[model samples]
Target: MAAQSDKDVKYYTLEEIKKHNHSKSTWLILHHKVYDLTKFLEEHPGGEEVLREQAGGDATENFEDVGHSTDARELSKTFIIGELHPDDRSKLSKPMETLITTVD
Candidate 1:
């Protein structure tokens, strides 16, 4: 595999990533980085459902919630396709409270 230098950084949009949400073409976001996990899905010890549940979306919270080990984190690097653009990153980073509503 070729080394990914700083100059080689790639960026993707949320819409582009959403299109890959499927068993045959799963993608997820973690800490602003986008990963193509289509091939890694079946091999995951957590089972395919865990990944599919967050397909085409940010999985950082779910991933961190599971307390993945160092080895798992290292393994994920191999699937990284690109980073989310700044605009999308900011959008995703916004507090959920701002997007939620309460009913009386």
Candidate 2:
């Protein structure tokens, strides 16, 4: 929504976010790459239908607790997708087991 900075961008409140609907436009989380949550939005468990609005804007305010595991945060460097929802972890190219096994 604003310029990219090191600060933790606060996602909008649920009520505010609920008002700004999503669309096919893409967005970046500053983690790395620009993510297109268009198709993925339609398949979201929180109701794919709502994704149309949320996908095009900053969802950080309403998505602070996106079911991220500690292991997943460690693996973020590899996959580059940052945090993920519990259901979408399976879709990651790098598996959690890989990270655990590689740990010394």
Candidate 3:
């Protein structure tokens, strides 16, 4: 309900985040918070297959599309352990190369 100024929170780079997508270790980027949904997968009424489709990557859009209840949104907070590092935030989707070749 207020600012989280504590240090328990952590941040993850995009590349590092890409490795946590198996059903046994699913993760999702939701509202900037890195959510580990694997443990909760079997609990949601429709979660068995729902998250698997969008669990391995950025799923903010899909999550909002459903407009889950406020209670559900609050529940999401329980799964959040960290966030995508600011430097890697822009690497999630949409943007791509601009025709420049690798210089190295």
Candidate 4:
């Protein structure tokens, strides 16, 4: 049998990630990684329903739009259970270089 390492990064397809949308098992993808924010639902500073709406979906766009701080992005890693499977990454909106501002 293959070794089941706890340290292994689980890879989840887009379809599988969408099934966890629930009060008890909400999951969302951010920057290609999967995050389970179920228990953190109500603890969200913005609101529970706020994040609940983004559950079981790619929250990368919304997440970037909010321009989160360094700490917020770092804290998200605590919930990381896996990443978007390689085959399904094509469906994710590519985070192209955004020239929000440039001196040139």
3-89 in candidate 1: lDDT tens per residue?
Answer: 755434579877778877866778888887888788888888968888888888888888778898999899888787788888777
Candidate 3 total steric clashes = 0
Task: Rank all candidate structures by their lDDT, best first, as comma-separated numbers.
Answer: 4, 1, 3, 2
Clashes of 1: 0
TM-score of each: 0.75, 0.32, 0.72, 0.74
Q: Give lDDT per model, in order.
A: 0.79, 0.41, 0.75, 0.80
Mind giving the per-residue lDDT tens digits that candidate 2 earns over 29-69? 32322243444554446676544544434444544457556
> Candidate 3 on 1-104: residue-level lDDT in tens?
98774545678776666777776778888887788878878887775787777765687887788788989888877677788887667654545456697877
RMSD of candidates 1 onward, in order: 6.0, 17.3, 7.4, 11.1
- Which stretch of 10 consecutive residues in model 3 shows the poorest summed lDDT? 90-99
Q: What's model 2's lDDT at 48?
A: 67
Task: Give stretches of model 2 more than 4 Å off.
Answer: 1-33, 65-104
**Candidate 4's TM-score:** 0.74
Model 1 is weakest, by summed lDDT over 10 consecutive residues, at 91-100
Local accuracy of candidate 4 as per-residue lDDT tens digits, 5-33: 45457898777777778668788778888
What's the lDDT for candidate 1?
A: 0.79
Clashing pairs in 4: none
Q: Which residues of candidate 4, in runs, are more than 4 Å off?
A: 1-7, 91-104
